[PDB]
Amino acid sequence: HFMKPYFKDKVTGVGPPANEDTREKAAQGIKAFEELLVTKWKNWEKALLRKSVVSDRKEIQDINQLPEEALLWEKISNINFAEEIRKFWQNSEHPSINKQEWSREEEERLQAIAAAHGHLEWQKIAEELGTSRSAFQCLQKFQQHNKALKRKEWTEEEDRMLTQLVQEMRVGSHIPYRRIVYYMEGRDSMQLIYRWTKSLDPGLKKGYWAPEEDAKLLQAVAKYGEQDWFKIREEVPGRSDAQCRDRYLRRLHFSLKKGRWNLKEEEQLIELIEKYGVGHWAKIASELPHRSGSQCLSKWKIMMGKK
Amino acid sequence: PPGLQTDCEALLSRFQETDSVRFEDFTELWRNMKFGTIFCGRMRNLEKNMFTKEALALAWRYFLPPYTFQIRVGALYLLYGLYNTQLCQPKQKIRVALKDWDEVLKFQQDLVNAQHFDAAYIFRKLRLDRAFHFTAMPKLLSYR
Amino acid sequence: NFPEYELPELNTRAFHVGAFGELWRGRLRGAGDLSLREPADSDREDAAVARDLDCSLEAAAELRAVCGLDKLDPEVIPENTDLVTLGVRKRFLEHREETITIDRACRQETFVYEMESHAIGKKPENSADMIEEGELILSVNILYPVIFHKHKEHKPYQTMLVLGSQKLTQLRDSIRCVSDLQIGGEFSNTPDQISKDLYKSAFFYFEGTFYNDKRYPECRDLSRTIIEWSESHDRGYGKFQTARMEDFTFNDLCIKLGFPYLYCHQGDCEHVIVITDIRLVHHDDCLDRTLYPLLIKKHWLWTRKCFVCKMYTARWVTNNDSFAPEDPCFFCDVCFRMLHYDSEGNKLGEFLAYPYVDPGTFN
DNA sequence: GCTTACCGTAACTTGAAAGTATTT
DNA sequence: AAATACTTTCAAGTTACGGTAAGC
Ligand SMILES: [Zn+2]
Ligand SMILES: [Zn+2]
């Protein structure tokens, strides 16, 4: 009622005429808030669009026995119901817009040809490879499949940038990571969450574990029973969730034999790799009575080394 | 606020019945029903603050003149207890308007006037320990 | 100037704010019970009550004894019976612990709490910057303009606390809107390359009178059009008046509690202001002057990602483009230059591209 | 030869804000 | 057509893995 415009004539509600700064600003090129949101079209809208297009698009006989295949602007759009139809239908375009499920064989051709063509003129490649698509869809697939847009490696120079941003944009405990990723080059929210929470924090402690820390960790685990490590992290003085989980599970457990191998455990490990698989170690360790997940992988590598 | 007014009216009636008001006698009910455990529900911070402010506002509402002379003193005791046992770091505070203050002071001086110094000293201590927010109106206002 | 209800439960009759503040200070400060100082004691306080309350000393001693505070397992719900609240809380906690694996402070709850309570109890590093003892505190509500579809049903708002002795312009400066950072020219055949602070001219509307900003020479006046139109022939809004904004402070502003006043800045962008709950300064709130105004509430708006990557945030918006399926399609800086340029601007001629400073990242 | 912290991503998860199919 | 619902998304995290570059 009182939102926009605030001043509306009681009888009519037109609102005051345009300002001077308003007309100048619109003439410059700046866009309002309402110009960047557009309503989406429901299913019935698409059905009506298609049937109107079909109806619009001996000869007396030709009219009436027309098959639905062969046939398949302001007049329609205004009187029946206005340039999105000129784009929606031309880009929905039942006859020739078929973004079918991408079979695996087309992906290799798309990637190789995109790399060899210089990653340019996407209309040209989308017309060269003859893939029944558009230029946009090829680029979307190439970007979703791309393996060169991220970094996945933390250097010295970008840790400092992360620290500066998270120290100038931290209100209380609230840390907005997405605004940082906007200010942080070539990253995303997941990697910043990982880095700050696990490694880059000034508060956290990085070093060896003393027996007193071990005793406190054992008491905390016996309190909580090997679940909810984010709660357990509180008892241990400053160690992170990942440190506590990894240390307790794969280093400190009550019964996990460690040290040099023998012949019999080698027997079981080799057979079990040849049976449950070679690429996964969780199950391989799960059946092995003593050794853990990491130890089986290390031992297999040492086997390969010996060979 | 899951039905506070039920417990509030229960305690206020159980103390109305006596007609022998004194802080020796209200604290007996406060410990016999142990109303001081109402703030030990293992709650977070936001719910803690909201619950405390709702309880204090309700007790204040019950303090005002349009009640009897018996409810008002019990509600004053309830204000004292709730403000004193709330578990908050920046303790939430009761909300006094402007149209109330003159009559509140009149009631206080009338209560001091006749040898009833218990509630008198209670109110004086509440005022002296800077427990109030002096606002134009009791509740926040906005169209919707 | 007693502030009472005009409408039944929602509105307050107008009142000169300064008179209200002076009325409180005169009515209450005479006893010395509002001060901004953080804190044989027994018998001395006993003499104090025996002299102020004016009861014989015996009764004062008896009361200072029997009142006390002790007469009236921390976070555990006991078996206590006659507490409906405890029963309900216990049931909810049990149902919560049996139906959740990972329970902690969610992002929204911690956001709102750590936003509202992140300055209380602060003290001025300087000593000459501390707030006075009797100055007021006003809470204002500033509604967002509509940015998404849903804001048309449950429109959001932002809240900030403004003192009673500082001018209007110190709130005009601190109202954060994205429409002070829009730069979008038209970059189509020039991919590489002042802001919307070239022209800055705004105004308030409080109880009929317009407050304009004529500090620096610009297209300063903005309330002339409404004065021209809405009252010469309409005969519907009485009479308005002008007064330069940088001349008045908040005490002079005769207002009402809970009414939608106006704030129009940068042409036609309009925010609806709903002032509520003015009070006196306590000794707990952040005692300072260079932090006010400060905001204690905000909205966690979403962010727009590029239509192709769906991994970065949008930086360029293209209108009337022959590639994309939708008309206002947004892009990052990689998709744009990788799809729209063949080592040269405007691969296809019918193509408009503008920079796009999204609100979700600037709020 | 072995062990020991560190490293980094895939996939779940809690829940308000925002979409949107249906109601009289 | 106002009002009501259900199901999407967004953005903090949290957990379970796969390896690394070290140590004696
Ligand atoms: Zn604005
Ligand atoms: Zn992109």
Author numbering:
A (entry chain A): 144 to 200, 240 to 254, 263 to 271, 277 to 502
B (entry chain C): 4 to 147
C (entry chain B): 28 to 66, 77 to 109, 117 to 237, 242 to 411
Quote the study that presented this structure, word for word.
The snRNA activating protein complex (SNAPc) exclusively recognizes the proximal sequence element (PSE) at snRNA promoters and recruits RNA polymerase II or III to initiate transcription. The vertebrate SNAPc consists of five subunits: SNAP190 (SNAPC4, PTFα), SNAP50 (SNAPC3, PTFβ), SNAP45 (SNAPC2, PTFδ), SNAP43 (SNAPC1, PTFγ), and SNAP19 (SNAPC5). The partial complex, termed mini-SNAPc, is composed of N-terminal third part of SNAP190, SNAP50, and SNAP43, and is fully functional for PSE-binding and snRNA transcription. SNAPc is a critical transcription factor (TF) in snRNA genes transcription, and its interaction with PSE is the first step to recruit Pol II- or Pol III-specific factors in the assembly of pre-initiation complex (PIC).
With the exception of some disordered regions, the atomic model of SNAP190(144-502), SNAP43(4-147), and SNAP50(28-411) are built well de novo into the other visible densities. The densities of the extreme N-terminal domain (residues 1-143) of SNAP190, the middle domain (residues 148-268) of SNAP43, and subunit SNAP19 are missing in our structure. Briefly, in DNA-binding state, SNAP50 constitutes the scaffold of mini-SNAPc architecture and it is surrounded by SNAP190(144-502) and SNAP43(4-147). The subunit of SNAP50 does not have any known homologous structure, and we divided it into three domains, namely N-terminal Lasso domain, middle imperfect β-barrel domain mainly composed of one α-helix and eight β-sheets, and C-terminal Wedge domain. However, these zinc fingers function as the structural component rather than PSE-recognition motifs, as illustrated in the structure. The first one is R445 of Rc domain, which forms hydrogen bonds with the purine groups of CG pairs at positions −62 and −61. Combined with three MYB repeats of SNAP190, mini-SNAPc binds tightly to PSE in a sandwich mode of “major–minor-major” groove.
